[PDB]
């Protein structure tokens, strides 16, 4: 699995490969790893699929009840609920989650909750087995305040490399753009990113 | 540790060593392995120092409570069973104790009960408990007669613990003697093996191996 979230001028973008394996077998080659916990608060999951799905479902439940009582939640608040679940249940969970959301006041934000359940706010984050291979690439090519087109390119190149070296990553590249304008879903097929 | 207790014509003889260990480390040579539950009840200790001490002291409090409640001295059978049933509740938890409850009661006469952490409870005339038990059995079994004089019985018990203190690396220190009649127990002193050995050797002509 290769997943990342990148903040930019107009907000933030989440991207991910679509491969889920059980051993060397590809159980799903078109998985959708971009998970919606609120209108403009999404997350990328890594680790146990059963665990991250159970986590996401609970978070979504909490944000829905939160909205009903106190209105739209901040991305920080969403990252906090994920954290609470991952930290408090660290012994029985294997979940690496990247939270990304667009706020009108705070614009785009990215929080990464790694294995232990700690939280880290960052300009951009990468995770998943395939991420080790792009630490160098991303560090050298990331810039703050990029444009939607530049961000989609940064993510598309970064992930194509992750898919290239990591057998656990592959399939198509999915992206979710979160801005004041709304929510946009993007998809990129192999025949395109394989030749970058 | 080596402890013994045996019944005979003159009542009961109880003898114990006084060595405490922490593996091969001699922790102490002056520990009391006999507890005086009451004027007519004695308890011997072997196994875990803390377990024995703690639970046998607790046993005393339970026997005392019985006497306040029933306005009557507790029987040796019932006292030994309090301990036996307590220990059985803890079976599997790791308690470690080899115990003997010895006493007198008009109703039972001289009585001895062997009670261990496995939950085993046995009435008997002769028992040797502890790492040195077999050494004591060797001497005690081959000189025991129901018709020993209080004087001779007291000596056999003392000589048996001495045997064990000599051959068992984990037994030693001194010998603590007791005699039980229907008038209660009678303490018969603390005998340091440091001097008891040489004395017994000379006077008896035994322990013929050791060079003196």
């Amino acid at each position: 699995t290769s997943i990342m979230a990148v903040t930019f001028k107009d907000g933030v973008i989440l991207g991910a490969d679509s491969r889920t394996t059980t051993g060397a077998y590809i159980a799903n080659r078109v998985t959708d790893k971009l998970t919606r916990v609120h209108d403009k608060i999404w997350c990328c999951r890594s680790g146990s699929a059963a665990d991250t799905q159970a986590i996401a479902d609970i978070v979504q439940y909490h944000l829905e009840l939160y909205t009903s009582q106190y209105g739209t939640p901040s991305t920080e608040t969403a990252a906090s609920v994920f954290k609470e679940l991952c930290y408090e249940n660290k012994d029985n969970l294997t979940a690496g989650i990247i939270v990304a959301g667009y706020d009108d006041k705070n614009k785009g934000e990215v929080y990464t909750i790694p294995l232990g359940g700690s939280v880290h706010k960052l300009p951009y984050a990468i995770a998943g087995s395939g991420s080790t291979f792009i630490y160098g690439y991303c560090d050298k090519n990331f810039r703050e305040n990029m444009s939607k087109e530049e961000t989609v390119d940064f993510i598309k190149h970064s992930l194509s490399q992750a898919i290239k070296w990591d057998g656990s990553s592959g399939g198509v590249i999915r992206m979710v753009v979160l801005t004041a304008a709304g929510v946009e879903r993007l998809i990129f097929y192999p025949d395109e990113y394989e030749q970058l | 540790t080596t402890t013994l207790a045996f019944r005979f014509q003159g009542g009961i003889i109880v003898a114990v060593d006084s060595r405490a260990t922490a593996g091969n480390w001699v922790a102490s040579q002056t520990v009391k392995k006999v507890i005086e539950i009451n004027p007519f009840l004695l308890g011997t200790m072997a196994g875990g120092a803390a377990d024995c001490q703690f639970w046998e002291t607790w046993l005393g409090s339970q026997c005392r409570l019985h006497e306040l409640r029933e306005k009557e001295r507790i029987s040796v059978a019932a006292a030994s069973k309090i301990l036996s049933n307590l220990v059985y509740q803890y079976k599997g938890a790791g308690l470690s104790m080899g115990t003997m409850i010895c006493g007198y009661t008009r109703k039972e006469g001289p009585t001895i009960y062997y009670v261990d952490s496995d939950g085993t409870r046995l009435k008997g005339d002769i028992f040797c408990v502890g790492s040195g038990q077999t050494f004591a059995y060797g001497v005690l079994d081959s000189n025991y007669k129901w018709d020993l004089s209080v004087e001779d019985a007291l000596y056999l018990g003392k000589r048996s613990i001495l045997a064990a203190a000599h051959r068992d690396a984990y037994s030693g220190g001194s010998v603590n003697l007791y005699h039980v009649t229907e008038d209660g127990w009678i303490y018969h002193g603390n005998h340091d093996v440091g001097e008891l050995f040489w004395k017994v050797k000379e006077e008896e002509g035994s322990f013929n191996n050791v060079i003196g």
Partner: protein, 222 residues
């Protein structure tokens, strides 16, 4: 996996005189091959003229001492400020220790004071409550190096009356506070020479009918 226990080193020593008693301990605290502190008191005055040290896993030693001190406090509250005699403290410690029989306070504890006749008294405990009153006792890392010495110099073991053909044992005359402080200091300089967990400093607490006094001596820091 997680190991709830650790070893902080240190060595403690207690000797009882006719009308006084002492409890000493080096002030070095270690972890493996490093020194955590060259001065971290390990012997405490718990009130009612009782000194105590729980040596081994320091967190357990501190929790115990803290729990006993609080015990004394409540003893006063519940029994019209009655003084807690050393023998009563000992039994009390036994229950504190045995209370954790299935997750023990990994410490070797010693307490000192005067009994109800004003005589010097030392009590030492096993990690789970096994205790006995004694004339002297070494505890901790160098216990194996020091106890033998004490059996010889405090209780005159193996010593005889010259010329009696090893027939007459050396009489058990009793030590003065001055003679005891010498044995203590020599015990620790010896321990500091042969055991790597002993050193830095020595702190002695002397108990008499007038209370608790403290003396401190430097020890080799290597």
């Amino acid at each position: 996996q997680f190991n709830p226990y650790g070893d902080n080193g240190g060595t403690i020593l207690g000797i009882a005189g006719e009308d006084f008693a002492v409890l000493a301990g080096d002030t070095r605290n270690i972890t493996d091959y490093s020194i955590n502190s060259r001065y971290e008191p390990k012997v405490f005055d718990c009130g009612d003229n009782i000194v105590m040290s729980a040596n081994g896993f320091a967190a357990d030693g501190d929790a115990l001492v803290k729990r006993f001190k609080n015990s004394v406090k409540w003893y006063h509250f519940d029994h019209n400020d009655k003084k807690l005699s050393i023998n009563s403290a000992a039994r009390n410690i036994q229950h504190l220790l045995y209370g954790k029989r299935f997750f023990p306070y990994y410490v070797h504890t010693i307490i000192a004071g005067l009994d109800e006749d004003g005589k010097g008294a030392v009590y030492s405990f096993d990690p789970v409550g096994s205790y006995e009153r004694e004339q002297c006792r070494a505890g901790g890392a160098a216990a194996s190096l020091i106890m033998p010495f004490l059996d010889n110099q405090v209780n005159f073991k193996n010593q005889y009356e010259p010329g009696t053909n090893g027939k007459v044992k050396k009489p058990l005359k009793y030590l003065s506070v001055e003679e005891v402080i010498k044995l203590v200091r020599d015990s620790f300089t010896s321990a500091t020479e042969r055991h790597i967990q002993v050193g830095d400093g020595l702190e002695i607490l002397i108990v008499t009918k007038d209370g608790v006094r403290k003396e401190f001596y430097e020890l080799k820091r290597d």
